[PDB]
Amino acid sequence: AGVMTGAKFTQIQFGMTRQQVLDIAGAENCETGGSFGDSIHCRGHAAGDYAAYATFGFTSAAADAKVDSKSQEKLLAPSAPTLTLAKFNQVTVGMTRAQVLATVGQGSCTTWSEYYPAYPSTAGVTLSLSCFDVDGYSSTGFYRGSAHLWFTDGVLQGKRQWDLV
Amino acid sequence: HPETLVKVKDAEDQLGARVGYIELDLNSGKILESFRPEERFPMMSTFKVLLCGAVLSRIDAGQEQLGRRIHYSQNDLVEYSPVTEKHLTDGMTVRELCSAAITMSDNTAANLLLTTIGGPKELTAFLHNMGDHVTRLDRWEPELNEAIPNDERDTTMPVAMATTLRKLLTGELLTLASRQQLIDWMEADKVAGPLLRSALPAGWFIADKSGAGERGSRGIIAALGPDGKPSRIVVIYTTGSQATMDERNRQIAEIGASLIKHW
């Protein structure tokens, strides 16, 4: 079939079992144990000095645990990257996810990470976003203009950027 | 060693960029062969082995603890951090940071480890103190990978890197325990499959660390040898090429295939 991909990432949903994750991602692309604990780590294509990848976290180490955490780098491409340093500068701690997206652009970000500590409740949900400017994203190399925006309960906690103009 | 230098030449002609190469004898420390051994190339992630060698020396001197747990936050996460991102809530021990930095080339782990020693200047001071006056780290991840033409920031020379690596893996610089750990981390490298490991015959040992950057920058440092025992250090760097990553890896892999054949 293939390596891990953005499509596969979007298909895997919170609430799924380990077996459902493997079936979708392709067990040949995934690993568990070692440095990933009881999480399932699935590799995409070669990229930079590593590769695009996804990591799925579970409610517990039980064989019947459910996905409560999804993370990835370089599987997802922004839909319409319109971020700039100026817009990044307007992003303010305390903004709601809706407000931040309104500032940086509705299609400038991808989900780096999303975790539900109280799954299935959304209480305490942490959201980590990777946002890019027009030419910033790179799925096989190094970004050339990007930002990291992170929230808790839908409220921005902090921001940081690299190489934006 | 013999025929490997035409390949290094060929590679330079296939990639249309500079290629630096040096093979050292692990035991004697004598240079076996070289090509542009004294030109600067961006270290990229290959610096992480030097970083953890510095961390291990601090452990040896009671200055650091492999089991010490470092708690970091979202602000610290940077591009290419598969292990640190997963352990963000619980943190990671110094030992786990080196394992991630070296075997998975985790960038946040390297930045965390740099902070434990005082930053890029202190890694440079550490290197300078052990006789290496060429290798220099100036920036954190991910900037150190820019490989700007003529820019000497975050660079080394094949010769300086090969000798420094030899001193770390076989000197008295580190204890046998630290040497075991550092080489084992390199032995367990999981991201360098397309380079030297792709031409490594069965039964052969290899402990390595690769690097990739912008401007077609690609490199690798290794201690390898037949009969599951390392006997030579190999250091290969290239930068400036426009060829695909697969082509750049292929050339490095071919260099390796040659040095193996004419061992």
From Swiss-Prot, chain A:
Name the domain of life: Bacteria
Documented effect of changing S130K: Increases binding affinity for K.pneumoniae beta-lactamase SHV-1. Decreases binding affinity for E.coli beta-lactamase TEM-1
Which cysteines share a disulfide bond? C30-C42, C109-C131
Q: Name one GO cellular component term.
A: extracellular region
The sequence repeats lie at 1-76, 80-165
GO annotation terms (biological process): regulation of beta-lactamase activity
- Keyword Transmembrane helix on entry: no
Instruction: Give the subcellular location.
Output: Secreted
Using the UniProt record, give the first listed, main subcellular location.
secreted
Q: Which UniProt keywords apply?
A: Disulfide bond, Repeat, Secreted, Signal
Task: Please verify whether the record's keywords include Acyltransferase.
Answer: no
Quaternary assembly: Interacts with E.coli beta-lactamase TEM-1; interaction inhibits hydrolysis of beta-lactam antibiotics. Interacts with K.pneumoniae beta-lactamase SHV-1. Interacts with K.pneumoniae beta-lactamases KPC-2 and KPC-3; interaction inhibits hydrolysis of beta-lactam antibiotics. Interacts with E.coli beta-lactamases CTX-M-14 and CTX-M-15; interaction inhibits hydrolysis of beta-lactam antibiotics.
Q: What does this protein do?
A: Inhibits a wide variety of beta lactamases.
Q: What is this protein called?
A: Beta-lactamase inhibitory protein
Tell me the organism. Answer: Streptomyces clavuligerus
